Amino acid sequence: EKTGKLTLVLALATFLAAFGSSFQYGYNVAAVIESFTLTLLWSLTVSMFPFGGFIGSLMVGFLVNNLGRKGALLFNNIFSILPAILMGCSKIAKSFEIIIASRLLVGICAGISSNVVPMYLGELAPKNLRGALGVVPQLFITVGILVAQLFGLRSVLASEEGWPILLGLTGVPAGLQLLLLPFFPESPRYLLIQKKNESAAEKALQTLRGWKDVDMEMEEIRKEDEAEKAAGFISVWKLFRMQSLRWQLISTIVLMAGQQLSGVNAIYYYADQIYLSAGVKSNDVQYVTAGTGAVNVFMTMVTVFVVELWGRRNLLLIGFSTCLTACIVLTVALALQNTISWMPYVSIVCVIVYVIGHAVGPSPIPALFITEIFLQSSRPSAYMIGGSVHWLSNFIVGLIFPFIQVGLGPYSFIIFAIICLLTTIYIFMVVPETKGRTFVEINQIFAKKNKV
Amino acid sequence: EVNLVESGGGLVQPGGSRKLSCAASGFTFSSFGMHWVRQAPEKGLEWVAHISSGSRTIDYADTVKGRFTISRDNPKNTLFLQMTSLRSEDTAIYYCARGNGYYDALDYWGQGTSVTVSS
Amino acid sequence: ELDIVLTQSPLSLPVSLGDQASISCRSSQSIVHSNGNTYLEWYLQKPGQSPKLLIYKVSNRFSGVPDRFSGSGSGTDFTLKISRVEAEDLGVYYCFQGSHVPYTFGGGTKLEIKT
């Protein structure tokens, strides 16, 4: 087969999609009796977002299979823009219910973006770039969180609120996407298979790849077509009834669930707590959170290039294993830190290790992997399932973890460690290496595993 | 090394017919588009026809539309040009050329086969 | 009918070895392809030999083409430059566009040694 290359059209399409959708997502997540009322209220509001992501994940297949991947990204853009306009109206008139609805729409945007962007870039790019540009959206998510907290702090230093600059900052990616992206090729796979347009898909592939002759890739796509013709519509339920997609389904579910059950958010808002354990100043903890963001982003770029070179499997293994060791060593660390002052430092280092590990294997990979594993017609439903598992896991952890932490203290991380080890074992005995392989080949591997 | 060797040429009367072939080796033939290019005696090069790797794309020079048919057989690693209703205008050396898809350009040429149309 | 025409100039270029030499190719309409690429190519043919690719995508040297060859141009105007003509460079140069069907060669430019 002829190796594809990165063109200006593909790099700009990737950039627009990832920037608008996934960077507004990454930036957004940072933005996302009376005592008892406060805990239930606060809990409800923070619960509206992952429930929103759940709903958005459910409506992925509809939008994708009608409007296309790009069209889905544009609806993701109206679901993104509407809360901002509701914020302008909030400037005019504001209620707590509008806050709830805003976090709901923002949630929907989050889910739809997180699912569709790797799908779009996955069907757009050639297999190698499918892996790299598959990682890219999470890179923009890390960027976004980074710039979010950095610019938030810089704002606070500059002024209480940055309203015109912030509104402009949220407007720019959506504006650039809405303006430029519609003029960029749709998924050639969507065009040739679902929309049944040979010419449009041909020209799309021409502009994307940079060469005139797309024939081999198109006939490959039609190989996928005739592979999915036996399957049919493949509703989520039918997906659950299919043995051919079964281990693939279990793979997606275990991957997403494990990812969110790895205790990421615990690390997220208890980071400052361990920094307090170290004795680090609030400005200095702000600095080391900035540093963790930098680590995440940098190691996410490294995660792009290494995802392409080493493969997805080995990186999943590395990430989950490093996070497992991070967890266990963390528990022993927290036990030892109350006894000895040398340890908590170690705990800091180990936390950094965790951030790295999860930045490599667990976070970026599973979505692109959902794209890689399944075929054209079964991909969006699989994204509904995997996305649902993702946001529901984030919800479950979200509400349940406070009680577990308050009750069991440091031991809570041991459960996450068990999850990490089980997951790692699963990846060892299940997950194939999808690097450089066409969807058909990976489907043949998985089909072989399912049949036997 | 990469080789392209054309055959099937020779002397033919006006109104007559002739089928040219081009045998390819040293590369994966089915991954590359292919062209026919001609050159009349004491004349410049004249592009004749193109066929994509999978035969989905086929194009002809204006001077041959309706008269020439280009085809290819990828498993047999062979390019063909079936010519009919030949005229004096058509007397020329016929080159088959490789379409290199990273560049889209004719990077390899055969030695050519000579076709002569006359009494 | 849609005819993309390629014009080379001059038709004949007498040179001494070591000379700089430039060859022009003009298209009757823009030859930018729908793929965003511009497929203007230069080929060299020596007597009794088959043509060989020198330049592709306006300014890129093909594998094996010495750096004394350089291609340039924009839109409708294109140039092939030879910084120092060597004996092995003598022959007929053709420009070619592969952007718009039917594809077309220029009429050729003969690069020849002075006598």
Nearest to A356 by CA among A416, A295, A411: A295
CA angle A435, A212, C55 (to 5 degrees): 105
DSSP string, B9-68: -EEE-TT--EEEEEEEESS-GGGSEEEEEEE-TT--EEEEEEE-TTSS-EEE-TTTTTTE
3-state secondary structure chain A: CCCCCCCHHHHHHHHHHHHHHHHHHHHHHHHCCHHHHHHHHHHHHHHHHHHHHHHHHHCHHHHHHHHHHHHHHHHHHHHHHHHHHHHHHHHHCCCHHHHHHHHHHHHHHHHHHHHHHHHHHHHHCCHHHHHHHHHHHHHHHHHHHHHHHHHHHHHHHHCCCCHHHHHHHHHHHHHHHHHHHHHCCCCHHHHHHHCCCHHHHHHHHHHHHCCCCCHHHHHHHHHHHHHHHCCCCCCHHHHHHCCCCHHHHHHHHHHHHHHHCCCHHHHHHHHHHHHHHHCCCHHHHHHHHHHHHHHHHHHHHHHHHHHHHHCHHHHHHHHHHHHHHHHHHHHHHHHHHHHCCCHHHHHHHHHHHHHHHHHHCCCCHHHHHHHHHCCCCCHHHHHHHHHHHHHHHHHHHHHHHHHHHHHHHHHHHHHHHHHHHHHHHHHHHCCCCCCCCCHHHHHHHHHHHHHC
Provide the residue count of chain B.
119
Q: Is B60 on the interface with C (CB under 8 A)?
A: yes
CB-based contact A330:A299 (threshold 8 Å): no
Pick from C12, C31, C56 the residue to mutate for testing the B interface (most B CBs within 10 Å).
C56
Q: Which of residues 212-231 of A touch C (CB under 8 A)?
A: 212
User: How many CB atoms sit inside 10 A of residue A220's CB?
Assistant: 17
Q: Is B107 on the interface with C (CB under 8 A)?
A: yes
Any idea what the CATH number is for the domain that residue B48 is in?
2.60.40.10
Residues of chain A found within 8 Å of residue B50, distances taken between Cβ atoms: none
CB-based contact C103:B50 (threshold 8 Å): yes
Choices 1.10.10.350, 1.10.645.10, 3.50.50.60, 1.20.1250.20: CATH for A1-452: 1.20.1250.20
Domain that holds residue B89: 1-119
- Residue A44: CB partners within 8 Å, gap ≥ 6? A100
CB-based contact A114:A211 (threshold 8 Å): no
> Reduced to 3 states, what is the DSSP secondary structure of residue B103?
coil
Which CA distances in Å does A391 have to A143, A365, A373, B40, B90? 21, 16, 20, 70, 69
Distance of CA A102 to the CA centre of its chain: 21
> Reduced to 3 states, what is the DSSP secondary structure of residue B2?
coil
Closest partner residue to A2 among B31, B52, B56, by Cβ?
A: B31
Please judge whether B56 and A212 are an interchain contact, meaning their C-beta atoms are less than 8 angstroms apart. Answer: no
B76 Cα to chain A: minimum distance (Å) = 17
Amino acid identity at A322? T
Tokens for B109?
Answer: 């040429």
Residue C56 main-chain phi, psi, to 5 deg: -130, 160
Domain ranges of chain A: 1-452
DSSP tag of B85: S
Q: Is A212 on the interface with B (CB under 8 A)?
A: yes
Nearest to A186 by CA among A166, A164, A202, A175: A202
Torsion of Cα atoms, C55 then B6 then C47 then C108, to 10°: -50
Say if residue A338 is exposed, middle or buried (CB neighbours under 10 Å; 0-12, 13-18, 19+): exposed
State how far the Cα of A52 lies from the Cα of A67, in Å rounded to an integer: 21
C36 Cα to chain A: minimum distance (Å) = 7
Nearest to B58 by CA among B75, B39, B82: B82
Which CA distances in Å does A332 have to A130, A266, B95, C7? 40, 17, 76, 79
Tokens for A214?
Answer: 């797309």
CB-based contact A315:A306 (threshold 8 Å): yes
Please judge whether B59 and C51 are an interchain contact, meaning their C-beta atoms are less than 8 angstroms apart. Answer: no
Please judge whether A215 and B57 are an interchain contact, meaning their C-beta atoms are less than 8 angstroms apart. Answer: yes
Closest partner residue to B112 among C50, C101, C103, by Cβ?
A: C50
- Residue C51: CB partners within 8 Å, gap ≥ 6? B37, B45, B95, B106, B109, C43, C44, C45, C94
Which chains are adjacent to chain C, needing at least 3 Cβ pairs under 8 Å? A, B
After which residues do gaps appear in chain C, with C to N over 2.5 Å?
none
Nearest to A13 by CA among A61, A70, A65: A70
Nearest to A446 by CA among A382, A393, A364, A384: A382
Q: Is C1 on the interface with B (CB under 8 A)?
A: yes
Pick from C23, C32, C105 the residue to mutate for testing the B interface (most B CBs within 10 Å).
C105
At how many Å resolution was this determined? 3.3
Domain count of the fold of chain B: 1
Residues of chain A found within 8 Å of residue B56, distances taken between Cβ atoms: 202, 215, 218
Experimental method: X-ray
In order of their start, the domains of chain C are 1-115 (2.60.40.10)
* A409 phi-psi bin (left φ>0, alpha ψ -120 to 50, beta other): left
Which CA distances in Å does A303 have to A251, A315, A337, A420? 21, 8, 32, 19
